Design a protein around this ligand. Structure first.
Ligand SMILES: Nc1ncnc2c1ncn2[C@@H]1O[C@H](COP(=O)(O)OP(=O)(O)OP(=O)(O)O)[C@@H](O)[C@H]1O
Ligand SMILES: Nc1ncnc2c1ncn2[C@@H]1O[C@H](COP(=O)(O)OP(=O)(O)OP(=O)(O)O)[C@@H](O)[C@H]1O
Ligand SMILES: Nc1ncnc2c1ncn2[C@@H]1O[C@H](COP(=O)(O)OP(=O)(O)OP(=O)(O)O)[C@@H](O)[C@H]1O
Lengths: 699, 726
């Protein structure tokens, strides 16, 4: 036989004392591994560490050969989750007697009802062998009818920790509050809801979805057939799937399995059917079982494409038949993780299989603040400044991106702080080092957001349109009672017409920044994107070009034909909608009727304030005191040029400087003069006059 | 040898002595398994729990090693059908002795004439191994009834069923009445023509066509005619074809072999046809065996297609040879399920291969009602207080719903009921919450028909009260679309069919599509919307394909209505016929509405702004026979529209009689007054924001803002186009 794989399972009957340090290995396996029942053996996940618990005969033969029963206390020491691989090693080192051990309490209660006439004996009757974990749940110990947890944090006198057998008189018992085990052994710590981010709605939905079949499957089976079993997690990558599934597996006492998917299927062999059947049979063997699937889309892509694969078809068919035959009254739940909803196979994403859909939204500034505070609390904050206002400012300054590799920002900030402190103090101890915020800001700028592959100070705005934009974003939304009682349709935005080089893009960026909600621009020449507007709900949608689709050509025709369905969807929830155009005369006559485009606003060159702000922002990279520019003469000279030619001027000046004196420390007026003379009068007056005529005829 | 698989087989004789706990295993494999004859072995389907049975020596030679022999009883424990996969394990556990057991036969009234000892002697021969699933014959001498049987219920004291050891002294048998098997053991319930219904003409025909070859070959031999070889079951997806195959396999004791789609094909050359040959040889080894093929279209497509290749042609050729070759013969039947028969190779669809073709159709109202009744009776008593009229109403509310979607609807209703039980009832016991009409009414949302997924858009929620128009048009349209449906027998005796056509010509903003969208929303029948320029494509023939697909979907989705948006966009180039695309589109439209193939369920409704370009071919009776002026509405309709619009406004506070406003509204068109009211509201909220009462100032501002908008020349043209008929 040679069993090279073993699993774990909690013992029944709720054994006390004798439950610890016992591994009821099969007698055939026990004799095969030349280990006596009265001997110490190493049980644990392969290649990681060991626990050194005493093996057992196994009592009756009704138990499966592969599985060995272990108590929950031992498993929690090395974070041995249900269904983890186990390995037995014959060699053993005699454990020395424990001396001057120390014990702690997980809860905050300390020095209360210190009887110790049975607690000390408890550490002796449980077959000895004291581990740093010692998660105690046996008997009923309390002080005023309240459960408490006792942890033997440390015992100092290739495994998780050296084995020590407790002795009645050779060691002294000291009690203190630690709330955690000693960090010298660096034992794994199970994840808790305190360490993870907030995600209140998502975590609540996931908890309800997991809980509903878990505790009452009999009622679902009696009421009907095919209860919900499949749970699908999708959204943007990096938001957290492996971490949350690990958390929900740790918090549950049911059997779990790790199914990556590439390892389950054997390439060019077609053994995925047998592998999946064996996995599901093992899951069905134990009533409490959890099925975890990672990257299900990669395992089973869409069947529409001819390149999906015959092995993909086989695995889809076997998954379908196994889900059909898994039964209804069983207490089984399947959790599937996928990268994008589009890559999910359409047959799998059908009613009756994955109805309970769980999605993780893009974290906002509040979620970023919450996760930052949670991480700072988890990290040792004996020195780090709390600074709620600083955290809020950092979160607001950061561009809106999903909670991906956010801990990497803290890691690189710590690295920068270490590098600064080493040079500052000539290799001093960490306790004397100081942590600042400039390094964190520099690291955050360097790493940059990776979600895609603007600020009100960065991009200015015109005051004339500020009141109108505020009205459009507030009155329909902030006070909808008047519209509801008067039956008045929402304005549904306005039409902005202006030259490509004017401040229309600047106005759009100012609107986006003032809204405070991230958005993706929709190109003119470029159904799925439009459908996502309703699903998200509170957001902003902007169209860069509408003139092309107003009257490629096929894409423009499709967009202008589907705009009719867009209006119907937008009628129910207008929220806010804006668009831009270059040829106003191409717009449809039926699109100018009241109730869809109530008002039309003309946009032109940026004002003096916006021009000054843009000049200051583009000069921020350069220097102002050495250059001597007042940031106003340039604006006066190039007021009518365009709203974006200043970037070209700065680029030309920088290029001239770097080709005239190589590395640059200051920028002289000669480069600016050359840039100004290079390009003159980019805009045209005739097209602006046409815009003015259109504005006049509009009303 | 290394035998890693086993197959169940029946005993040649009834084996009156040892019906139960008998499994013949070859001595060679048994010796290699280190299992003695007096040792228990668990056997069961792969991926499921096993059933323990005592090992038995094989019947000398001429006995296959792979097969394991059972007699009608061990197979029925886990609903093991002949030909299913089996797995053998050497792990055995001694079971406790049985005590206080009860036996009750299904389909039989509680009677005490069994003498209570003849059944006991049968249990003595069992010699242990007592499980809740046992099926016997009880011989004879029982009320003179030949077709009776007895089944054990359970016993009151990692296996599919709990095994107990029978003892005559302490058996303590008690008689009781109960249906099928106990649900607390989660045993596989043997289904036999319970869920499938509404296709009697088809299901009994299939049953006869399956029964006659296998069970009555003597008449075929005497008549000199070859028995049927293959039956093809083709139909729309979600019609229960796989369920039909499963039930027809379960209802018979045949050696079924199942292959499901691309699960057999592989990139390795010489493997798909080898597996098919092995399957056919195994089927031919046993006379009563049945071969089942699922998704034959994806396995053996047409060779005429240029994208097929060579492996597809080879697999098609080997399938044809195995079905009918010089050396290919037997006493087997092949069942193939597919969605489209066109993709199937014509050589496969030959009377020698597939003489009988089964065309599964979309369930009708009676079939849907039968399926719903069966689904609701599946849970039997103690719930479902709804009577037959509620089920009939639910069935009538669904038109294009396939049988697959009804199970999903029931599951959604159940889960919604469970979710609602956590709210107001505050986690009360679910044994008394039962099922109400409100639950299914709420669950009716967020579910779509299987064949009506992609082309369906967001459902409008506009009713009759929201819209306002002339009563004549709405009454005529309601009567035209409801009389064939409300009273079909009246038209049957009268011998008059539906007009199937109607045209609405009028000026824009004349209340035409709104009277159609609201009708589609209220009626509840399937609705299809076709836009004007949407069908127009640069490539020639794409529009024709789209129109044909839309018409086929309408035909296959029960009687419905097709409404065209901006049908005036297509025209014969305004003079004669020059562009080929427009002429082809028009000709295809006429052919689809009325051509060689006759369609009656769907009713065509269209609205055109300018009927001048519509030729007499489209205007002839039988396509767009009905014509309605659909001009401006009367004073009452406009007054109702204004009252509905003013209903949001404080009518009591304002106190205006709006009679002069009614006249002013009559002075304009339909959408013009709505735009006037919207612009007046916008002007009011821009001038003095919210107002408790709307005065005449804002209304006059709207009147001066929007002037005219309609010219009388089109009104005169419509009047003459309505009056020149005579
Ligand atoms: N909500 C969160 N709260 C706290 N930390 C988080 C959160 N989401 C992500 N993280 C951090 O980011 C890491 C990335 O998450 P995880 O390892 O679960 O990957 P994933 O997003 O599921 O994977 P993939 O890149 O394949 O989409 C986590 O290990 C954790 O450190
Ligand atoms: N006529 C019917 N009566 C009762 N239940 C039905 C009927 N048709 C379908 N169902 C239910 O809907 C399910 C869907 O059918 P099934 O999965 O067997 O596929 P199918 O309809 O044969 O289609 P496909 O071609 O996609 O395999 C069935 O398992 C059954 O529960
Ligand atoms: N009786 C009415 N009540 C309310 N609104 C109306 C009425 N008649 C017209 N309208 C308004 O005018 C629009 C056009 O009317 P309708 O839906 O009848 O279009 P139609 O006659 O099919 O014409 P087309 O689609 O070619 O513009 C409606 O969507 C609605 O906003």
């Amino acid at each position: 036989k040679l069993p090279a794989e073993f699993i774990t399972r909690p013992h029944p009957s709720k054994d006390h004392g004798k439950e610890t340090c016992t591994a009821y290995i099969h007698p055939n396996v026990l004799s095969s591994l030349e280990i006596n029942p009265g001997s110490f053996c190493t049980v644990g996940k392969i290649g990681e560490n060991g626990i050194l618990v005493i093996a057992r005969a196994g009592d009756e033969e009704v138990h499966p050969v592969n599985v060995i029963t272990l108590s929950t206390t031992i498993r929690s020491v090395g974070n041995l989750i249900l269904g983890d691989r186990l390995e037995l090693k014959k060699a053993q080192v005699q454990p020395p007697y424990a001396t001057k051990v120390t014990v702690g309490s997980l809860q905050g209660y300390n020095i209360l009802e210190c009887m110790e006439e049975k607690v000390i004996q408890k550490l002796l009757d449980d077959s000895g062998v004291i581990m740093p974990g010692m998660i105690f749940q046996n008997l009923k110990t309390k002080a005023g009818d309240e459960s408490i947890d006792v942890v033997i944090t440390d015992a100092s006198d290739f495994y998780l920790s050296p084995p020590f057998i407790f002795r009645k008189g050779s060691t002294h018992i000291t009690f203190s509050k630690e709330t955690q085990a000693n960090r010298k052994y660096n034992l794994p710590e199970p994840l808790s809801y305190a360490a993870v981010g907030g995600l209140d709605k998502e975590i609540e939905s996931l908890k309800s979805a997991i809980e509903i079949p878990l505790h009452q499957p009999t009622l679902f089976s009696s009421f009907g057939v095919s209860p919900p079993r499949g749970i699908l997690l999708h959204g943007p990558p990096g938001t957290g799937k492996t971490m949350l599934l690990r958390v929900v597996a740790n918090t549950s006492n049911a059997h779990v399995l790790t199914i990556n998917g590439p390892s389950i299927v054997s390439k060019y062999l077609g053994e995925t059917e047998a592998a999946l059947r064996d996995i599901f049979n093992e899951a069905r063997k134990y009533q409490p079982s959890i099925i975890f699937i990672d990257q299900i889309d990669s395992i089973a892509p869409n069947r529409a494409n001819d390149d999906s694969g015959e092995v993909e078809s086989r695995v889809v068919a076997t998954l379908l038949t196994l889900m059909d035959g898994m039964g209804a009254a069983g207490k089984v739940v399947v959790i599937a993780a996928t990268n994008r909803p589009n890559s999910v196979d359409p047959a799998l994403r059908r009613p009756g299989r994955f109805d309970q859909e769980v999605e993780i939204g893009i974290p906002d500034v509040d979620a970023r603040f919450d996760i930052l505070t949670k991480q700072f609390s988890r990290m040792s904050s004996d020195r780090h400044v709390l600074d709620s206002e600083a955290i809020k400012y950092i979160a607001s300054k950061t561009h809106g991106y999903v909670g991906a590799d956010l801990t990497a920002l803290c890691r690189e900030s710590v690295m920068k702080t270490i590098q600064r402190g080493l040079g500052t103090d000539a290799n001093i101890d960490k306790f004397s080092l100081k942590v600042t915020l400039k390094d964190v800001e520099s690291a955050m700028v360097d790493i940059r957001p990776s979600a895609m592959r603007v600020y009100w100070s960065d991009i200015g705005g015109q005051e004339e349109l500020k009141t109108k934009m505020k009205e459009m974003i507030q009155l329909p939304l902030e006070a909808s009672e008047t519209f509801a009682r008067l039956g008045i349709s929402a304005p549904k935005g306005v039409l902005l017409y202006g030259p490509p080089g004017c401040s229309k893009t600047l106005t759009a960026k100012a609107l986006a920044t003032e809204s405070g909600i991230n958005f993706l621009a929709v190109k003119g020449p470029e159904r799925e994107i439009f459908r996502k507007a309703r699903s998200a709900a509170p957001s902003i949608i902007f169209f860069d070009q509408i003139d092309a689709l107003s009257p490629t050509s096929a894409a423009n025709h499709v967009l202008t034909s589907l705009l009719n369905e867009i209006d119907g969807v937008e009628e129910l929830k207008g929220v806010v909608i804006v668009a831009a155009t270059n040829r106003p005369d191409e717009i449809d006559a039926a699109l100018l009727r009241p109730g869809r485009l109530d008002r039309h606003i003309y946009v032109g060159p940026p004002d003096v304030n916006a021009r000054l702000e843009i000049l200051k922002k583009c000069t921020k990279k350069f220097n102002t005191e050495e250059s001597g520019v007042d940031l106003h003469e340039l604006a006066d000279r190039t007021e009518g040029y365009s709203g974006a030619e200043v970037v070209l001027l700065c680029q030309e000046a920088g290029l001239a400087a770097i080709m005239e004196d190589l590395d640059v420390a200051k920028v002289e007026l000669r480069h600016f003069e050359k840039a100004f003379k290079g390009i003159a009068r980019g805009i045209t007056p005739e097209m602006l006059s046409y815009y003015e005529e259109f504005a006049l005829r509009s009303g």
